[PDB]
Design goal:
This is part of a larger assembly, with chains A and B. Chain A is mainly α. Chain A is built from 8 helices and 2 strands. The chains are: A mainly alpha, B mainly alpha. Chain B: Associates primarily with CDK7 and cyclin H to form the CAK complex. CAK can further associate with the core-TFIIH to form the TFIIH basal transcription factor.
Chain lengths: 315, 57
């Protein structure tokens, strides 16, 4: 219970999907995917927006338009089959709460701007901003500072609901120490961060945070300052490769507080980046192996690309 | 006298900037609570978000 964010939308509004008759919002597309291709370029081609199921990728004359968006349009898509220089199908899911450096209306504009006003059914519309971007920093005072957002227009519903549920509130040797605290700036703009309600109330709060129409992003401020201890990490000449160099760069494009979940293909640097996350982050980490089968393996490359082993090993 | 007066003037300015910052945002906290700003979502909460820097300045 209390585990309900926005499930994947399309369930209805369609009957015998051969919409040779209706295709009404696709007729908005099929107007401009067809009115536009006359003089040797298409300037059209809406990714073949289909209301139910998913939509496609053009990817056959991408040039710059959809070849840039061979990747970038795929944020909420997943591109489930792969092909030759032709169309490419996908699916659709939860992947807007990952795409939180952008507004659901901002993509909707470019969802239209890709589609040459190939208009949504609305199915996506009633599923665009169901979860407004919102983070949960874990700042220096031992639990969390009640961060909201770069943008203000969300506390206006929140503080009119949340506190009426649950409130919130030598020289040169030390000169640089406040120069670090000087770097503790506005968190890109305004932050709007509040004070911990006694560390035992967030569980009571999180279940009601999502309860209106928001969703929360748990972070990990464990790198600049940390009050408990730090283990000895040491990356002994572990030269690695740009598939996983991009990975932690996606885990850290911001500051030192954001969690992460990354998919690799099989046989990839699985026991590398977590071992890289074991050492760079400066935490005291944990692996949850699938079986002891995993457990022997994952320490072994940890025994390889970390010299952290002086009975410092916990299987 | 002077340096002790100087370091206390440093000490109070430490005490000046700290609890100012601690209260004006706590003022900015309850600025929203029990009132949805004067006439807009943003208005006096910008107004208060601009008045508090010249107080330190």
């Amino acid at each position: 219970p209390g585990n309900d964010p926005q499930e994947a939308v399309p369930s209805a509004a369609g009957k015998q999907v051969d919409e040779s008759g209706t295709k009404v919002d696709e007729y908005g597309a099929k107007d401009y995917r067809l009115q536009m291709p006359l003089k040797d370029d298409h300037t059209s081609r809406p990714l073949w927006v289909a209301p139910d199921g998913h939509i496609f990728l053009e990817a056959f004359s991408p040039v710059y338009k959809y070849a840039q968006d061979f990747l970038v349009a795929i944020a909420e898509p997943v591109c489930r089959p792969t092909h030759v220089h032709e169309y490419k199908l996908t699916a659709y899911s939860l992947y807007a709460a990952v795409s939180v450096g952008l507004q659901t209306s901002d993509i909707t504009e470019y969802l239209r701007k890709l589609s040459k006003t190939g208009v949504p059914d609305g199915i996506m519309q009633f599923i665009k901003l169901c979860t407004v971007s919102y983070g949960k920093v874990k700042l220096v005072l031992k639990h969390n500072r009640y961060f909201v957002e770069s943008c203000h227009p969300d506390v206006i519903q929140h503080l009119l609901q949340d506190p009426v549920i649950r409130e919130c509130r030598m020289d040169l040797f030390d000169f640089y120490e406040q120069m670090d605290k000087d770097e503790e700036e506005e968190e890109e703009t305004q932050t709007v961060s509040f004070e911990v309600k006694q560390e035992m109330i967030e569980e009571l709060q999180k279940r009601c945070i999502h309860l209106e129409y928001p969703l929360l992003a748990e972070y990990d401020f464990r790198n600049d300052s940390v009050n408990p201890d730090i283990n000895i990490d040491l990356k002994p000449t572990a030269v690695l490769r740009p598939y996983q160099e991009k990975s932690l760069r996606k885990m850290f494009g911001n500051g030192r507080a954001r969690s992460g979940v990354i998919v690799l293909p099989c046989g990839a640097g699985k026991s590398l980046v977590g071992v890289t996350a074991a050492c760079t982050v400066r935490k005291r980490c944990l692996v949850l192996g699938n079986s002891a089968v995993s457990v022997e393996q994952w320490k072994a490359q940890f025994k390889m690309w970390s010299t952290i082993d002086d009975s410092q090993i916990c299987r | 006298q002077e340096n002790e007066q100087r370091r206390l003037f440093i000490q109070k300015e430490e005490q000046l900037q700290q609890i100012l910052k601690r209260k004006n945002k706590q003022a900015f906290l309850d600025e929203l609570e029990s009132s949805d700003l004067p006439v807009a979502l943003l208005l006096a909460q910008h107004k208060d978000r601009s008045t508090q820097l010249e107080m330190q300045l």
